[PDB]
Amino acid sequence: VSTPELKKYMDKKILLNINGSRKVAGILRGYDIFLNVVLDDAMEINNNHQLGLQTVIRGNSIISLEALDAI
């Protein structure tokens, strides 16, 4: 329908809180109309253990997607 306005967050480090407790930081690579996001070089902030080279996050469990860069 309407693609979310994330064309300015491309290839910039962001930190988004999975569900209500987890917080994942990575480099955004793409997104879908459901607000699914694929972010590379993830790191589960808590010491903090990396996730993998390429992860996808279902847009249902995303709450906020604040960006840790110039934007």
Binding site: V1, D32, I33, F34
Partner: peptide, 16 residues
């Protein structure tokens, strides 16, 4: 075109 599911179909079907 209704819910985004139809649009995602018209992407996945081409992807396969």
């Amino acid at each position: 075109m209704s819910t985004p599911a139809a649009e995602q179909r018209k992407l996945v079907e081409q992807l396969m």
